[PDB]
Every structure is written in C-alpha cells, then in structure tokens.
C-alpha cells in the first residue's frame, strides 16, 4: 500500500460523530502520461511529508495519539468537553477552530521546544 | 484539564484543484494507440466504494477542475502523437479533378515530386467534396485548410479505439463519488461515497449526441448551469438508451503516393463495387418513445409547449452529429426524421443521409488540422445514444446544438469531486503529558 | 543546324480578322530531356529590335494581351492571332530553343 | 527585366577583325540566371545565332557554321559582354544584337522547378558595315 | 537515503542469530532518467518508514508486538527457526501470510492506543 | 506461544525491474554518451563478499540489457534532432569517377545562400552511399527513397567513454564470480555493488571490440546450444589484437544546401589512395579459433567447420565498428575464416570499405550522415568475442542476427534485485 | 563532556550550487514564462542574522551562470510553435521609401498554394539587408548564417520582474553592507527565502530599469588592473532616459508560403523622422563627474573616456530593447568623448532600428520582431555603465558579454545550503 | 516550498551567538515547460535534504525530538578544549571548521553504538 491505506482510510470513519470517530476500529475487518504520473508521485510524497513534519517537530513524532502540555484557551470556543466530544461531526468542528488553526501550531512548537530543553537542563545539570 | 491534543487520523477534507494521473484496464498491450501508447499505471482491483454514511455534502459540476484537466490532456495528448507524423504541405497544388461515377466522391490529379526533388510525376487521388474547395466553377480545386493551417496526417500505425481510461488522484487525495439516483447536476448529495479512482470513461468525441456514454440510474436526468438562461448549454441523460449504427458499403482500399523524398501519404485507390451513400439506422419506435419520455421531463421545468427545431446550420462541424468510427470520421445531418416535429402532449427504422471527411479541423484552434488516412474494407459500428446536447432558443423551441466539446466530459464526470485530506485534527481533552 | 519551315511567308489582312501562322520542326523536338516543348515565337516591327511573343508553345510573355495564342504538336507548331489590329503589323519569327545553336526561321511578314 | 545597349564601331574595313561590346544596365553579367547571347539580322538569311556564355564561368558555345572565327567573354568590373569577329567578310554586314536569355531556379524545399523564358530582353542593335 | 540498505544486505547467507554479528563488524535523457530514479528511491523508503509508523514502533531497529504467533504460520519454535536459516528460507515459509500479518499488526497497534487513551479519558 | 516481532534491516530480496541511471569518471566537450550530465566519481571498492549465498539468474530473460537498448537508441535521438537535416541534397546527381573504383568525383546542383540561384558543385561520395539510377550517368543517395536523412554535427563525436549504471538508492545489483559460469542457473559465488565498474557503448555486429577479456578461461553462452537460430556468443581469454586504418589524407570541404543548412563533404583525395587496411595477428588467430573449437567440441563431441558470413546485405555479412568519426564495413570472411584444422611471421589482412550513410538499428525511417574526419585515423583494439550463428559435422557462420545480442557479452553477470528489508518472525517478548 | 550529543536545528552553512525556480504576481502569454508560477512570496520574511561575519565574492557566483543558461532556454522554448521565416530569403529588388535608412523592397513569394506566386512589396531598414555583391538587389542579412525565426505575433517580450527563490532546506544570504563592492567580509549579512526581484531587460552599454545605488557610486570589477575585464559602475541618483520612434507606422500581412503569414511594415505615414533619445546633459555631465572622482582614487592618475567604436554594431552601439521594439544608438555621437579636470537643456542621440537580431552573442539563432503599430516613447531609468579599461588611463563604454548585466543585480546574493546536524560533547548519557 | 523550509530558516537565525546564548535564544523566535520542469527538480531535491537529516537520526537513535542525549565515549583526542571552554567562547561555524575532519568517523562510531545499544537492550529482553 503506497499510502492510500491511511490517507483514504481516515475517511472510513467519515462524518460520523466524534464519539464514534474515537473508537471506530473494527471497521477494517518519457511521453506525457509519464510526466503527469511523475508529478503525481512527487506531489503525493509532499502531502505526506507535510503532516509528518509538523507531527514530527511537535514531539508527537510517530505516536498515533499523544497528549500535550499547553492549556486550552476559552477564546477558541465556550462549549466544553462533553458537549463537543459528542453530538457533533468533526468536519463541523473544524469549521469553528479553523479561525485559530494557523496559530495553534505555534503554541505546540514553542511548548515542545521548552519541554525538550527542560530535559537537557535537568539531565545535563 | 482542558489541554489541547492532536490526532494523526481524522476525516477532514477541503476542495482543492490537483493534478490527476491515468489508470487503465490493460486491454491488450503493440504500443501505438494514441491514448495509452506505452500506457499508464497498470489496472487495479477496481471495486473500492466506501459507505460514507449520511455526510451532507454539496458541490457544483460546472466549476470542477477535473474536467478542465481532461482538456489539458487529449489536446496535449494528440500533439504528442501527431508530431512525428508527415506534413501534407507539398500537396497544396492546383488540382485537376473530375468525377468517378460510371454522390460527391471526386477524382483529382496533381503534380507530385518523385523520389528525387527535381523530377515530377502525375498522380491521381480521390477526394470527398468536404476536403476540396472551389478556387472561386469547374476544375482547379484546392485543399480546404491549407490557406490557414499546416496540414498533417495521422500515421496509419496508431488507432482510435476509445479504450476505457480511469482517473486516479495522487495518494493523499480522494474522489467523492455521488450516488443519489436523481442528482440534478448541482446540489446536495445525500449518499456520497469515496473511491480512489474514477469510472472508465471512454474518449468518444461526440458533438450533438453523446455516444457510448454511461446510462443514468433508473431516472431521466437534465443538467444545466442555468435553465432560465436563454443561451447557455443544456445536457440531457437517458435511461434505457437507444441504438444507433452506421456503415459505409464502399469497399475501399488505400493507395500510397509519393510526396518528395521519404515522405508518403495514403489516399483512396478505387471504388470496389459501386458508390452507395453512407447510412445510419435508428429504431423509429425507440426514438419516439425515448424522446417522448424526455419531453415530459423537459416540460416540467418550463411548463409550456416544447418544440424541437433542427440545428442552426452554417457549417458541418456544429450543425451535424459528428463522431469517430474506426478512424474515418463522419459528419451527419441528424435531422431528416430525427427532429422538425414535436408530440401532441410501424417496425421500420429512421435513416440519416451523410458523408465522410478526411481533413478534420478539431478543437476549434486555427492553424492546426489533421488528415485521417482511409480505412480499407467496409466499416461498421454500433453505439448507444446516451445523451442529447439540446440548446434552448407562449412556447419554447429547443435546437439540437453542441457547444464546446467539454460538455461531453462534463456528461460523465458529473458524479465526482476532488478533495484534499489533511488528517491533523486538534481538540481539547482532560490530559497533559506526565 | 535543325531547320524550321514556315507557312505563310506573308499575309495581308485588315482590322478585325483572325490570322494563322505555322512552322514545322525537323529533328523531332521535345525529345524528352525531362523537359517540355521548347518552342518560341518573336515579332519585330520595322526598325526596332525583336521582342518575345510566346515561349513553350502556349505561354504568353510579360503583360502581352490575349490578341494571340500559340499551339503545337510534337513536331508541328502553329500560331494564331485572335483579332488583328493596326499595331500588329510586324515580322513574326518561329524560333526553336531545344539544342544549341538556336535557329530562327526566315520571317513571317504580316500586314 | 534588363535595359541593354550595344556599342562599337559601325564602319569596318574588309577582311579585318572586329570587336563589338554591349553594356548591361541593371544587373550582373556573371549571375547564373542569365545566358547572354548575340544575334545578327542578315538581309538575305535573316536572323542567326552566334554564341552565348554565362553561369559556369567559362562556358562558351558557338554556332558550328561560324565556330572558327568567334570569341566572347565578360567582366563584372565593367559589367559588359564583348564579341570579337575575326576576318569579317562583306556578307557579314548586318545589325548585331546582344540579348539576355533568362533562366531561373526556385527551390521551395519540396520541389526545385527550373527552366527559361527564352530571350526576354534585347538591345537596340548595332549596325556594322564592311566597306572601305 | 537508500544507499545504506546495502549494509543490511550483508550477511544474507547466515543464520538469523548470526546476522547480529555482521552489523557489529560493520533536461535530457540522462537528466530525466535520473529524476525518475531519484523519486523512486524516496518512495520505496517512505513506503518503508510509513509501515513502521503505522505499526507504532517507528524508527527503532527492532520491534516487539502484541499479536500472537499462530501455529498455522509455522510451528517451529525458537530453537529451530533461528538455528541455521537465512531469511530467504524464512520468507518462503511466511510468504503466503504476509498481508494478513501486516493488517493484523496494524489493528493491534490501533487498539492499544485507545487503551493508552483510557487512562487519559476515564 | 511466542509473539510477533518485526526486524528492521533484514536482507531479504526479490527480483524486480528498475529505471537505472548513469555515472562516469567525470571530460568536457560534446561527447555523445556521457555528455555533461552523468554523475561523477563513484570510486567503488565496495565489492561486498555476500558470503556463500545461493542465487540464480540468466542473462537471456534479464530485463537490464533491454533497458540499455531502451536508451542509447534514444540517446542519439537527442543529438540528431538539433543538427542539420540533409533532405535537400536528394537531387539528380551525376558522377563519372575520381582520380588524381569506389570513389566518385560527382557533381550536382545545389542552391546558394538564397533560394533563387543555383550553384554548380562537386563533392565526393564512397560508392556505397550512392545507387545508380539506371550505361550509367545519374546517381542518388541510397536511403533517400525510404527515409529522411540527417547529418551528425562534427561538434559531437562517437568516441565511447565508459558509462557506469547505478541502482537507485534502495535497490542492489548482484554479481556472479564463478568464472566458469554456465550462462544460466545458480551461481555458487555472488556479490553486490551499487554500480558496475565498466561498460563501453561501442557498437559492433560481428566481433566485439575493447571488451573485457574473459576471466582466465574460455566461455560459451547461448539460449539453447542445440538450436539453429539462437545466436551463440564466444568470450575469448587471452584476447587477440586487431588494427584497422584509413591511410588516405582526405580533406574536409563545406558545401551549402539552401539558406542556413549546410554540411561537410570529402573534398579531394590527397596522396596515393589505398584500400582501408585491417590487420590481425594471424599467428595468434590460428590457434585462437582452435581453442574455442575445442570448447565447442566439449559440448558436441564432433568436429566443426567455419564458413563465410551468410552473405546478402552489408549489415549481417560484415564486421562493422567505429574507428571514431568513421564507419567501417569489412568482408572479414574471404581471407579470414574459410576452414578448420585437424585436431612463420605474418599478419593476415582483410578487404574493407567505408560508408558515409548508415542504417543503424536497421529500422525504417531512420538514417544519418557521418561527417568524414580529415586526414589519417588509426585505432588499435582488442577482439574479445565472436558472434556465431549455427547453420556428421557442425557448421558455423560469424555474424550475429541482431545488434542487441552484443550487450550480453558484458552485462551477463548482473541482476537487479529489490532489497525489501522488512521481515517478520516470532519471539518470546510481548509489549509490556 | 565524555559523551557526544546530536543537536538538531544547528546553524551551519556551506556553499552549494543548486537549482532555482519561479516567482510572480499580478492575457495570452509572455516570453519570460510567468503564465503559471508560484505567487507573491512576500518580502518581509528576512532574518537580520545579527553580527555574524561572512566573506564572499560575486564573480565566482552560481546565480548568474544558473540564470544565463535559463533565459537562453526560455526564449528558445517559446519560439518553437511559430514560423521559421526562411521562405522570405529570396532575391530582393529594392527602391527607396519615397515619403536613406529605409528601403522598399519587392520579391516573389509562394501564395496559399504551391505553383501560383505573386509579387509582393514590404518595407525594410537598410541596417539588415545587404546588396547582393549600385546593384540595387538585396537579401536578408542572416541567410548564409542560419535560419531566422519570427517572434510570435501574439506573445509579448517586455520585461517582468522575477524573484529567485531557493528550494526548501537552503537559504540565500543577502549582503546588506550598502558600501560593498562585491568582495570582502560583509559585516552586515542577512538571509532571505526568496530574492527581492530582478528585471530581465537586455542592454549593452546602459543598465536600464535597474536597481538604484544607495548613498554611493560603487565601482565593481574582478580586476581594475586588467585591460580586458569589464568594469561595472553602480550609480547614485539614477538618471532618466527617453527613447521614441515617432513614426506612425502600420503593419501589413504579407502571405508567404502556405499556412501562416509574417507581418511586415507597410506605408511610412507622414514623413520620415529618425528616432532619437534624450538626456539632460547637466544631469549626465555631473553624473559623469561623480564617477570621475571615484575611479580616480583607484588609479592615482588622470582619466579619459572615448568612443568604443570599431565593431560589429552589436557591442559598440547602445543596443537595448523596449516597448516590443529594438534600438541601436550611436551613444557616443558626443555622449562620452570627454575627460574631467574637476542650464535647463537636453542632449539627443541618433539611433537606428533593426528588424532582425542575433542576441545572446551566439550564432545559429536569429529572430524577426514584427513592427509595433503606432508611436512609442520608451522611458527608463539608468543605473550603471559597462565601462571598459582600455601617462593617463583610457576608458571606453561596452561590456565583454551579456552576463555582465545580470552580474550587476545578483551580486548581493549567494546560494547556500544549511546543515542542521552538529555533534558536540555534553555531560549526560541516556537514562 | 514552505513546509520543509520554514524550520530551516529559523535554525539559521541567531547563528552569530555562541552556543551558550544560542540554547535559550532559540525560544526568542516567539517568546511541462522549462519553468515547470525546473520547479519539479526543486521540489524533489528539497525532500532529499529533509529526508537525509531525518534519516541520520534514525540510524543514531535520535528520532523526533530536537536534542537527544546519547551513549558513546568522547574521543577526547579530537580537542583539548571541553564543554567548559568551547561552549561560551565559540560559534557553530568555527566549531564545524575544526571538527569537520573527524565527522564521518563519529557517524560510523555512533552507528555501531546505537546498534549495540538496542541489541544489548534486546539482550536484556532475551535474558
Ligand atoms: C576502443 O576502440 C576505439 C575504436 O573503435 C579506439 O578509439 C580511439 O583510440 C585512440 C587511441 O587510444 C584515441 O586517441 C587518439 O589518438 C590520436 C593521436 O594520439 C594522440 O592522442 C592520444 C590520446 O590522447 C595520445 O595517447 C597520443 O600520445 C597522442 O597525443 C588522435 O587521432 C586522436 O585525437 C582525436 O581527438 C581529439 C580531441 O577530440 C581531436 O581534436 C582530434 O582531431 C582527434 O579526433 C585521439 O587522441 C581516440 O580517442 C579514439 N578515437 C579515435 C577517433 O581515434 C580506442 O582506442 C579503443 N580503446 C579504448 C580503451 O577505448
Ligand atoms: C487566547 O486567545 C486570544 C484571542 O482570541 C488571545 O488574545 C489570548 O492571548 C489567548 N490567550 C492565551 C492564554 O493564549
Ligand atoms: C490461525 O490461522 C488460521 C488459518 O490457518 C485462522 O483460521 C485462525 O483464525 C488463526 N488463528 C488466530 C488466533 O489468529
Ligand atoms: C593529412 O591530414 C592530417 C590531419 O591532421 C594533417 O595533419 C596532414 O598535414 C595531412 N597531410 C597532407 C599531406 O595534407
Ligand atoms: C573591494 O573591497 C575590498 C574590501 O572589501 C578592497 O580590499 C578591494 O580593494 C576592493 N576592490 C575594488 C576593485 O575596489
Ligand atoms: C592541544 O594543544 C596542543 C598545543 O597547542 C596542540 O598541538 C594539540 O593538537 C592539541 N590537542 C588536541 C587534542 O586538540
């Protein structure tokens, strides 16, 4: 499987509610055309390096799920855990926080950097 | 709690234009076939549909970028095939010409340079009237497009079998197939489903009636950008499609004649038997029943009398049912008993009188034209009429006329949309790393 | 060397009539050579130098009218004036140009 | 087209050698498309062809009847063609012309046609008289 | 990238146990044809680095997993299969079960993540 | 009992097909093969032992040689297209002879700087290039009626620089070292390398040239020895030297064909012309064919005989090779094989003749004009392999039936394998 | 210490020759690609890179060589679909334009079919048709050299700014020492992802539309003590130049051969008015005065300027491009021809148009530029001089090649690779 | 274009500071056709730069996090100077110039050290 098993399989959960999306695991049970295909393979690779790069540099590398150490900001939304974690499709959830997706990443980058230097500053000391 | 967390798997997508690439069913593999040639990514275990349950999604077909890429291909793919072939430039000389009957299938002669650039040698070659043009009336004819374009001839090596072609998206994207059996061209699709590669579309270049197209599911469909607009095009699909066949009884065989050193081109040698005009037969009852059903469907979006009036005319590219067959194109009147009357609310067949054309100007681009060599032996074919390019014009008059041939490709990529998957979901949670 | 015969040697005529002149070859002429019938006609008024009338049997010179036309077989060659007029009075020469030296005929004096 | 003009003495003594010249206007003597030639209009015999040369530098050819006594050449430096008649006889008294038999050669890649249009342009003609 | 794989190709003729010692001892036609090759090198490495990521034990030279050894695959225990076989023979034994092994391992990784998530969600 | 473990870096591999790429020592100037493109350096002492692992491969169904011919044929296409085409020269061409039997002091009409004036011209051509149009006064270039013909720019040269193929990073190229290799089947000694250390793209159709001499022992190769259509390949040990030479002092002359387009032709013969010599050390050659025959007897238990080539055209019948900027075509049969043996200082000569117009790859619609190199040229080289076709006794005729078979004499010992270092095994550990 | 540690993200850089790609922002086609490319790449993304030194030179650079082998390909890649104009190369018979620098020629040409030909007339400039030897018969200048290709009538070839941007994983160290001459430690260095933007205008004696100098006249050269290496001057207070072709010209579509036509000049409306280019002499005179002092201190002796004539009219004349039309001016009629000891008006230059060119100093590639209908009034800034170092020192305008133009703009950049791997000892060991 | 190059630019920042200031200073960041084919080579080559620098870490067992502590003896013959005098007196460019000679040896030494560490860990799993 090139990478379609993951980047198409993640639509298998589809617009099912977040509660379902958190535990839906059993569902698995030369020439011109050459140039068009080459541009596809190179572009396909880039779309995979992009997410792994950010997922990699955050300290969340490899691990499928991981928690973080930067607290929530109520400005992002008021509705809380048990209200959003159920009775809402994720794609709908992406609508309201896309207003901060371009900035929330920076908090992960700075928080991760602080975390890893904190390790060296204690182990090397 | 209330700390942010990340998920490296989540269903999310956005509408994104992206390059696509080919996939084929590996129907044989001789590598001179214009479309495939050396061919594209080999096949797949095609059934891959996914439930994608109750996801509310909407899209409009007339803006999708996938159809446009299928006009970046073809026209660029034909250029990749026509470039090595011969130029018919040295053949643009004054033609002494006459008739061949014991229909306008003429017999012409000209100067022509032999294997040496110096000596000349008279050679006779036949031509249909749609190639020659009057000099201003008898004799001294000339090739039509030579006054604007560099005429070139398709090499006999390649063929034009409309082989199925499957469109795949690069890994990391997906195609959201729409399954609602009355999808009216644009709007919500309540039963969307994903698929890695599309259906096997056939590169059939029709212009007034869409041949070999996919059948609509259990209901007649009518699509348009704006049904209330007076000028914009309209596309109709069908269910229980109707038959159409065409044959050329003339048992022709190609002669090869010299044009300078090295270069050669092929033309008609002799008419075996006798000239019998090309024919196309269509079941009269099927067409009447079929168009009658569409008549009700067309009525219920205007609520008035609908009148079929034949095409506008002025040429043969626009006003005729042009289609490819074997490698010798047809351009056909499609009006005798096919239109010109409407409904109030025998087991014979309809006839289409029509003809052949060698030098075809295609894609409506000035400066380029292609010459199709004659195909030996009598030629026959059968196909399904699966769509009409009706154009709207108290009452309402519908003129069968096709716009740009991109309409054909929008007639089968209607149920597809390109999406970009970005599985990097963010959410709050109770935890924090310890 | 090769000799051209001519008939008529002279021909009087009035305005509006048509006239015909003929000359015949001796050594075959248009002997293939990957060429064509290299026969030519010239006319000359008194006092002035000769000038070209026809070349290759049936092709008119630069800008001259349709008052005249030429024709000929493999060895027989003819010239006809569609409608004579006042300025057409001259001596017409049958000239072959197949092989050197080029040889004229002894004139054709039309009035 | 080429305007043309003959020049040279018109009075010649018997039995001597005569040189005649013709100057070209509006062209080159050596250009291959031309084939210069000289013709004389006798009173008894009429017109007759003497010689011509052009194209392949040294390419003269003379009438066999008068092959013995002729010479002709050219030079772009003055752009003229001159004819020498050796041992003139009283019968040679006649008007001598210089004429440009025109050739052509067009190469349109595919076909290389080639031919001639006969003797297009003639000079005024120069009269020479053999007397003393 | 890629060129290091030749080091792994070493000790092909050896016992599976003995393989640990060897690692201890350790435009234009030419232009486009290279680009087609260069992109290929990346793909068959990312299709390798992705499998480990999908299997959770990313990067580490060896992986310990949770799924059991079905006797239907091979009922030779530790003392035999590591004795004198190079992986060429072992590939033949396990060849028919490769794909099911991959997906079986994948779900086993996905299900432990939610188990790890239980402590963070209970 | 026991649990699954995944071991990274497992050495398992499988057969594959790959788009290999090029590399070379470095050389500047418009060399056709290496160009200014191929990757430099790769000094390769990395011949890994790969101790005693069994492996099998056959050079016949190998899909690396066909990849070598999928390019090179395309490589020249990259260099023919820019250069001047030679179609307008196809004109009625009138020849008599050349002297100061095989060279014509031939004349033709060609257009000068502008397309309105012709210009008489003379240009030499070797007898092979022209064909009599007819007792004969007119001629034309041979390949005019079948194909358009182009002209090689003198800026480029065919001097074969060696080229190294390299597996893309992630594959591996195997190598068999059993010097008595069958030609097919398991090999007891195998090794691996990123890139092979030497190949030469020299073209030859009857005898190999500059090739790697066999590894200390004579070798015989074939798809099927007991067959009469498959080409036998012989790979010599203790190679035998060859030398061909053009002793003339021909001078290059540039002539014009319409605007812009122009080409080079042989102007004049300078000095006393002699037939192009090809000398071979006959003293070595005699027992050289004796030794390969003894190997052939090792497989067929009877005497053998050698005849001339199969005759016919000048592509199957003749030793054809590049001396560099010039194409040779030698009889190489009349005074050279003729016979066999039972069980004096001199060198044998061959009749040979040059050909400007060639039909390489023997396919329709393709041809080229070889620009002659001025002056004398000599090229000493080594013969290392004969190509033999099989016609009480055994008969052979030199001359391979297809030029692709030549590459098998140098790329036989490699097979591309896709190293796939992902493997599965049990273990006692489980995730804890 | 006692233990190494891998530090990812380390600042370490080394020189590297590598490819560069698109940039554009803000129709049919343009010769400089730009019809489809990456957008905008805003400017303020620099890192000032505080107080770290870096020494480099502009002459052994990669960008200029990386570029000159690209622009020469961009034009060559654009002209493939359009006509090779060889069939026009026939015997011309030319009269004068009765309305000496312009001639009105006549020729036979192949019409829409093979054998029927017609006499056609078109206008030409005497600078590029040569008599075939009064003669009065001419041919196109470039017929014995190579084919000549018509510039496609629909495309446009006026300059558009293009930014060079290095691939991800590299950086471009922009030097910010405003008084820098292109060789030495740039004590105020900076790094930029995508360059600021450079204009592709071709010239031979004046750097038109170029980036202006800042608070200095800077003279740059690999060797000021060499008599064949080029001198480049970068100008304080760029002067303004205007060029025009005030003839109200019209174009005619003469048909030659089959297929497509080539556009040619028709009637010269009104009367012939030679083109001219205007300069304010006081601006130029005291602009020359400024450079007269700068280079003086680099030679300690008096200086002179001269004509620079004696060439094939490509390098000797002020050759440049503007408004879809080409120009070749004397540019030393009285322009330089002066030496320095220490009014509102203008000085004007007589100039020549040429219809067909041979650019990039090469042979085998000449092209035809169809005329621009109507008058044009090309106006541009001037920022540099391609002076040449020929008792006293002699100077003459004119470069040695055309890469010198690009070398004037890209001097403040050098492509560099970043190596984020660095080993360093540290006290810890793995837990 | 941006994703794999944004971090590289940040690394280049503050290069003029010595390593001691550089550690905490890093947080101050927040606290077809010719020009189509050429663009393809740039996009492919950019991946080959990121993939190399990341792939080396996998060989060294230094995956994911920015800094990683390691287990391999310091071959002190490389330099008299140690942490207490190189760390606050020198910049990375100076460090690379005098250390680049040895670098390839450390990678191989670090390669085997990582290998034996994980397999000696396997010797702990197999005890
Ligand atoms: C493979 O087989 C081919 C033939 O099929 C042989 O190819 C030629 O081999 C010769 C000899 O090795 C090459 O060298 C030529 O030598 C000639 C004179 O010798 C001078 O140069 C050599 C090499 O540098 C020196 O050793 C010697 O001392 C002399 O200085 C010249 O005729 C040749 O010069 C050619 O190249 C230059 C540069 O391009 C041109 O300017 C010249 O005009 C001329 O073309 C050349 O140096 C030669 O390169 C090969 N080609 C030709 C055409 O002869 C191989 O030898 C044989 N073996 C191998 C290993 O490839
Ligand atoms: C929360 O978000 C707001 C903007 O909505 C921002 O101003 C504020 O600084 C954020 N607070 C924290 C603690 O990040
Ligand atoms: C073991 O393999 C068999 C097939 O050989 C399969 O049916 C069975 O389910 C497997 N058992 C387990 C526990 O995986
Ligand atoms: C023969 O040709 C060579 C080519 O290099 C030249 O050096 C030599 O002088 C020539 N000999 C004669 C006699 O022209
Ligand atoms: C350029 O500047 C350097 C110092 O950076 C100086 O030493 C040198 O002389 C200057 N060169 C020229 C040609 O002005
Ligand atoms: C230590 O210093 C001495 C004296 O300067 C020098 O020669 C030697 O190379 C240094 N050793 C190391 C290991 O750096």
Numbering used by the authors:
A (entry chain C): 513 to 541, 568 to 663
B (entry chain G): 33 to 61, 64 to 136, 152 to 185, 187 to 309, 312 to 321, 321A, 322 to 353, 356 to 398, ...
C (entry chain L): 1 to 27, 27A, 27B, 27C, 27D, 27E, 27F, 28 to 105
D (entry chain H): 1 to 35, 35A, 35B, 36 to 52, 52A, 53 to 82, 82A, 82B, ...
E (entry chain E): 515 to 540, 568 to 663
F (entry chain D): 33 to 58, 63 to 136, 152 to 185, 187 to 309, 312 to 321, 321A, 322 to 353, 356 to 398, ...
G (entry chain F): 33 to 58, 64 to 136, 152 to 185, 187 to 309, 312 to 321, 321A, 322 to 353, 356 to 398, ...
H (entry chain B): 512 to 542, 568 to 663
Copy the relevant paper text.
The cryo-EM structures of 6070-a.01, T646-a.01, 42056-a.01, and 44715-a.01 (solved with 3D molecular reconstructions at 3.6-Å, 3.5-Å, 4.2-Å, and 3.9-Å resolution, respectively) revealed modes of recognition similar to antibodies PGT145 and PCT64, which represent an extended human broadly neutralizing antibody class that utilizes a needle-like hole-insertion mechanism to recognize the V2 apex. A single Fab of each of these antibodies bound at the Env C3 symmetry axis with extended HCDR3s inserted directly into the cationic trimer hole. For the 42056-a.01 complex, consecutive anionic residues D100aHCDR3 and D100bHCDR3 formed salt bridges with R166 from two protomers, while the third R166 residue was engaged by cation–π interactions with F100HCDR3 (bottom). In addition, K168 and K169 from two different protomers were recognized through salt bridges formed with D33LCDR1 and E100gHCDR3, respectively. In addition, similar to antibody PGT145, antibodies 6070-a.01, T646-a.01, and 42056-a.01 each contained tyrosine-sulfated HCDR3 tips that penetrated deep enough into the trimer to form salt bridges with conserved residue K121. In particular, the sulfated tyrosine residues in five of these structures were positioned at precisely the same location, while this sulfated tyrosine of the sixth structure (42056-a.01) was just one residue position downstream. Each lineage recognized two or more apical glycans from multiple protomers, resulting in 41–55% of their respective interactive surface areas being contributed by glycan interfaces. The four new lineages each interacted with conserved cationic amino acids from all three protomers lining the trimer apex hole, most commonly through electrostatic interactions with Env residues 166 and 169. The penetrance of these needle-like HCDR3s into the trimer hole to recognize Env residues 166 and 169 was consistent with mutations at these positions to confer complete loss of neutralization sensitivity.
Here, we report 11 lineages of V2 apex–neutralizing antibodies from simian-human immunodeficiency virus (SHIV)-infected rhesus macaques and determine cryo-EM structures for 9. Envelope complex structures revealed eight different antibody classes (one multi-donor) and the complete repertoire of all five possible recognition topologies, recapitulating canonical human modes of apex insertion and C-strand hydrogen bonding. Despite this diversity in recognition, all rhesus–V2 apex antibodies were derived from reading frame two of the DH3-15*01 gene. On the negative side, to penetrate the apical glycan shield of Env and bind underlying conserved positively charged residues, broadly neutralizing V2 apex antibodies must contain heavy chain third complementarity-determining regions (HCDR3s) that are exceptionally long, anionic, and often tyrosine sulfated.
